[PDB]
Design a protein around this ligand. Structure first.
Ligand SMILES: Cc1cc2nc3c(=O)[nH]c(=O)nc-3n(C[C@H](O)[C@H](O)[C@H](O)COP(=O)(O)O)c2cc1C
Ligand code: SF4
Ligand code: FES
Lengths: 87, 430, 214
């Protein structure tokens, strides 16, 4: 339920091929940018950083949970379906 | 006046306390019940609530809230929902048996009290929730209710007052927590007796989600007499803000354990000696008293000498009036084992809903069991004190608080007795 | 000891026969009508209690029948049957002896009553006699502490007991007689022994002390 990891903008690269190492079975790669993650304070900072480095980018809008109406008293309604059968 | 006690039989309300007169309607009428009820009803809600406010009556279920203020939360225009009065007859606090006598010997006082109180709140019916173990009392109460229906005193056109009122009896199935006012409402609604959080308050959202007042049997039963004889008469007993008469249960180590009606603010010493026949073996044999039932902390013999039995006086003694159930322990008693068995009760009675009481009370119970043997070290006494303070004030309902206070009463007044057992246990093994 | 999970057995399973007798069905619809329309889950505690008064105890089939009769989910009936301690989810004896051992009773020697019952019946608390006529358990306060020590046997209270008194009550039940509820000490209910200290005067009659203008 913690939300502390949904507060900063992140830049990550497109995932590339990983393959099995014949000796040990380890996951091998040829992608030098496979672990690169950059943190940004604003969407506009991240866009600016990608553009000067010549990287094509896709930007997705931040999703905030919608405000909700919580009423503990609704659990005991006279005539509504919100009445809970158990506690 | 500054001296209280020596109540006269003319001023007693529960005149058939001991079941020596007929408990049916014929006897109840002779004793003055159901007299001028139609007159009281037609004087209206505001007048009735005025009498209860003037009398200074306070809750008899344990918490002692001013009754007239509480009952006035229902004095509001309806919103299309029915209005209800619940009468708490669960009576499950160890040491308390006062409500049991009202229902079996003065059932028509309670039924009339339901109507007068139900009218003042504007309620359509009364649900009396009685503990399941009180089967014979529940059947006495239904016989009285049937008699009142046949005589026109309740039901359609109650007492000829053009006001409709029903009185249903619902029985519990064995749970002390169902005496908590919102756990009782849930149990009526067919659920586990788990208390609700507040808000909402029952006067807003109660049983079936409707405006409700939960009132104690003793609170409800004395209301018709307060209206007939007036709030000034009732306010003439006990200290200010602690007025009226009260039913006391004296049990434990007394010569004559009994139930008796006495004026409020009566000295605790006078109550035990006059009515209960004194402490088993003399006043000097007294060790400690639990003055309000299990939930109230014990006090030692030194405090008991001068303490008055009313709400404010026992608050200054670091305990409380509670249900006015006096439990007496003489010096032959194992004080630690006595309080440990009370923690064992609360552990068996926790509804389990909320973390501090579900886990904490069970934790306190285990530590107390080790304190009885002395299988602990004195550093744990302060640990148990802190654990009880973590439960208190942090739970949904007052059961958690009522479990913490007995521990604190023991630690406050009998720390040397605990540390002495730990010393004996350590040397008995080392 | 007393578990809160059901596991099927031949004697207790969903096919164990249970039904309400026709007389008890008339009693159910009186119970249900005590509540607002559309709030008939309120009838679970009485109806579930009625199934046990007919049957003595509650197999899973009896709980399932209550849920169907009231059209509540069975889990909501199971929750109730496992919460309230008066429902017997295992069979009990003909006489269910319940001895209070809370502190007000313990101070007046409820331990002696429990010891006498164990040795007399030859069982321990929580067990049933081999002939299945008594079950013995300890209970919390029954609201009769001034009349301690006391026991409940089915719907009746037997109070102000001594080891000799409890033996008599056990003999009467083995014989087939009903002992009689109440104190076994000489007093009638909750009065102080040795004479009333209050309410010795006649009641004052109708209209006494009424305020003027009422
Ligand atoms: C665990 C617990 C048990 C209670 N048991 C009872 C009871 O058996 N009878 C009662 O009148 N109040 C009992 N109360 C107090 C009620 O919650 C409530 O305050 C009271 O019944 C109604 O208010 P009144 O006394 O002013 O009339 C209990 C409270 C708690 C926390
Ligand atoms: S304090 Fe105890 S009895 Fe009260 S709601 Fe919490 S767990 Fe239940
Ligand atoms: S302590 Fe036994 S009946 Fe109350």
């Amino acid at each position: 339920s913690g939300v502390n990891n949904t507060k900063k903008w992140k830049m990550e690269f497109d995932t590339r091929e990983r393959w099995e190492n014949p000796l040990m079975g380890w996951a091998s790669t040829a992608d030098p940018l496979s672990n690169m993650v950059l943190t940004f304070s604003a969407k506009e900072d991240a866009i600016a950083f990608a553009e000067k480095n010549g990287w094509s980018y896709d930007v997705e809008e931040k999703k905030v949970p919608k405000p909700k109406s919580k009423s503990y008293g609704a659990n005991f309604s006279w005539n509504k379906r919100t009445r809970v059968s158990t506690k | 006046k500054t001296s209280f006690g020596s109540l006269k039989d003319e001023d007693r309300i529960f005149t058939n306390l001991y079941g020596r007169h007929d408990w049916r309607l014929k006897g109840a009428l002779r004793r003055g019940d159901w007299y001028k009820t139609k007159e009281i009803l037609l004087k209206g809600p505001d007048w009735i609530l005025g009498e209860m406010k003037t009398s200074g009556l306070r809750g008899r279920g344990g918490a002692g809230f001013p009754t007239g203020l509480k009952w006035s939360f229902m004095n509001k225009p309806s919103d299309g929902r029915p209005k209800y009065l619940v009468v708490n007859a669960d009576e499950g606090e160890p040491g308390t048996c006062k409500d049991r006598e009202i229902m079996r010997h003065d059932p028509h006082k309670l039924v009339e009290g339901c109507l007068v109180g139900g009218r003042a709140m504007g309620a359509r019916a009364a649900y009396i929730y009685i503990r399941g173990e009180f089967y014979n009392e529940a059947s006495n109460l239904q016989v009285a209710i049937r008699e009142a229906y046949e005589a026109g005193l309740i039901g359609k056109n109650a007492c000829g007052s053009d006001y409709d009122f029903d009185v249903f009896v619902v029985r519990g199935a064995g749970a002390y927590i169902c005496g908590e006012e919102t756990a009782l409402i849930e149990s009526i609604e067919g659920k586990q007796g788990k208390p609700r959080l507040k808000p909402p308050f029952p006067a807003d959202v109660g049983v079936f989600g409707c405006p409700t007042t939960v009132a104690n049997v003793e609170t409800v039963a004395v209301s018709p007499t307060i209206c007939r004889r007036g709030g000034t008469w009732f306010a003439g007993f006990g200290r200010e803000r602690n007025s009226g008469t009260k039913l006391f249960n004296i049990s434990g180590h007394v010569n004559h354990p009994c139930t008796v009606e006495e004026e409020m603010s009566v000295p605790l010493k006078e109550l035990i000696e006059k009515h209960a026949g004194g402490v088993t073996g003399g006043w000097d044999n007294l060790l400690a008293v639990i003055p309000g039932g299990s939930s109230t902390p014990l006090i030692p013999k030194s405090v008991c000498e001068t303490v008055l039995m009313d709400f404010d006086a026992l608050v200054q003694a670091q305990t409380g009036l509670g249900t006015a159930a006096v439990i007496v322990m003489d010096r032959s008693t194992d004080i630690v084992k006595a309080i440990a068995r009370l923690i064992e009760f609360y552990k068996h009675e926790s509804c389990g809903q909320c973390t501090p009481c579900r886990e904490g009370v069970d934790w306190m119970n285990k530590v107390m069991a080790r304190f009885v043997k002395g299988d602990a070290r004195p550093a744990e006494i302060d640990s148990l004190w802190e654990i009880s303070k973590q439960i208190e004030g942090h739970t949904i309902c007052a059961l958690g608080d009522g479990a913490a206070w007995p521990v604190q009463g023991l630690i406050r007044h009998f720390r040397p007795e605990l540390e002495d057992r730990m010393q004996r246990f350590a040397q008995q093994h080392r | 000891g007393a578990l809160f999970v059901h596991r099927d057995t031949p004697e207790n399973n969903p096919d164990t026969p249970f039904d309400f007798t026709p007389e008890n069905y008339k009693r159910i619809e009186a119970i249900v009508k005590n509540y607002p329309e559309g709030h008939q889950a309120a009838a679970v505690l009485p109806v579930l209690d009625l199934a046990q008064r007919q049957n003595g105890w509650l197999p899973i089939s009896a709980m399932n029948k209550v849920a169907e009769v009231l059209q509540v989910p069975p889990m909501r009936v199971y929750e109730v049957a496992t919460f309230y301690t008066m429902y017997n989810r295992k069979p009990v004896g003909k006489y269910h002896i319940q001895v209070c051992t809370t502190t007000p009773c313990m101070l007046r020697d409820s331990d002696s009553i429990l010891e006498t019952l164990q040795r007399k019946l030859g069982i321990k608390v929580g067990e049933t006699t081999p002939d299945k006529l008594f079950t013995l358990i300890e209970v919390e306060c029954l609201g009769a502490c001034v009349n301690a020590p006391m026991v409940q046997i089915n719907d009746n209270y037997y109070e102000d007991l001594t080891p000799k008194d409890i033996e008599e009550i056990i003999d009467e039940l083995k014989a087939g007689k009903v002992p009689k509820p109440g104190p076994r000490s000489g007093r009638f209910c909750c009065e102080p022994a040795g004479g009333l200290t209050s309410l010795t005067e006649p009641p004052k009659g109708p209209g006494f002390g009424v305020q003027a203008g009422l």
